[PDB]
Design a protein around this ligand. Structure first.
Ligand SMILES: [Ca+2]
Ligand SMILES: [Ca+2]
Ligand SMILES: [Ca+2]
Length: 282
């Protein structure tokens, strides 16, 4: 449907159940049906033409609940809950399944990983990561899921792991040049883009890109704004960075990276400021 969906987050006072969608044809945001549950630190993905919002924090607990938006009915419906409560988890989709990666359960930072089967409406565990990671960024590239950065309970991480769906286990790949917790992670062309985050000292406007052909990370032009708790997605050959936290304020601004001009430019802001939001393209 070629729209960017911005899901939940925290606006500085409220944990949001609000959802809005960006139309690139008109450069405008409009609101969507709100979720059943408030969710900051939420993970979101699209599976068989529906948007899933998994985990997060509702203002009182970390969540194992998971809800599913159908664009036709404009309704959010709960599906089976995750086995682990997870805020600041990563969420992605591979081979018809949703993968919930890491996160924080209210006491522990998780290395556990669970997969959702929409045909049986059940979650199952898969291989845990080598490293515990909340505030992790995930994405899929070819036959693998990548988990980059995050926070292991005491350190912000620059390490990066790859889940090979054939070997069914996680292995380390080249680390990021910067440590990044609460970063955004997305895939463009054949590369993984790591966007923003927090390095233990400041909130980052920097960006770097992973080439699987060479197992190396390289510099890309930084964004105009520092953003941890940012959501990122690709739409029509451009990368969008929406929301986050610049070190002082939750953000409603949105920037778009053009790969030709290597330039970030602001587009229309969202109606709500959202740190620790989910962002996906539907
Ligand atoms: Ca057009
Ligand atoms: Ca089916
Ligand atoms: Ca190759």
């Amino acid at each position: 449907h070629g729209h960017i969906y911005a899901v939940g987050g925290y606006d500085g006072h409220t944990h949001l159940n609000s959802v809005e969608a960006y139309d690139p044809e008109t450069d405008t945001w409009s609101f969507v049906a709100p979720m059943n549950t408030r969710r900051s630190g939420v993970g979101v993905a699209v599976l068989h033409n529906a948007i899933y919002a998994a985990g997060g924090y509702d203002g009182q607990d970390q969540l194992n609940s998971v809800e599913r938006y159908d664009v036709e009915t404009e309704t959010w419906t709960f599906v089976a809950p995750m086995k682990h409560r997870r805020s600041a988890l990563g969420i992605t989709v591979h081979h018809g399944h949703i993968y919930a990666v890491g996160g924080y359960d209210g006491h522990t930072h998780l290395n556990s990983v669970e997969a959702y089967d929409p045909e049986t409406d059940t979650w199952s565990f898969v291989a845990p990561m080598n490293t515990r990671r909340s505030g992790v960024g995930v994405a899929v590239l070819h036959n693998a899921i990548y988990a980059a950065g995050g926070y292991d309970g005491q350190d912000q991480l620059n390490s990066v792991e790859r889940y090979d769906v054939e070997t069914e286990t996680w292995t380390f790949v080249a680390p990021m040049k910067h440590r990044r917790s609460a970063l955004g992670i997305t895939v463009h062309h054949g590369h993984i883009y790591a966007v923003g985050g927090y390095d233990g000292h400041t909130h980052l406007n920097s960006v770097e890109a992973y080439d699987p052909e060479t197992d190396t990370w390289s510099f890309v032009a930084p964004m105009n704004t520092r953003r941890s708790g940012v959501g990122v997605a690709v739409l029509h050959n451009a990368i969008y960075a929406a929301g986050g936290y610049d070190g002082q304020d939750q953000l409603n601004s949105v920037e778009r990276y053009d790969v030709e001009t290597e330039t970030w430019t602001f587009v229309a802001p969202m109606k709500h400021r959202r740190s620790a939001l989910g962002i996906t393209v539907h």
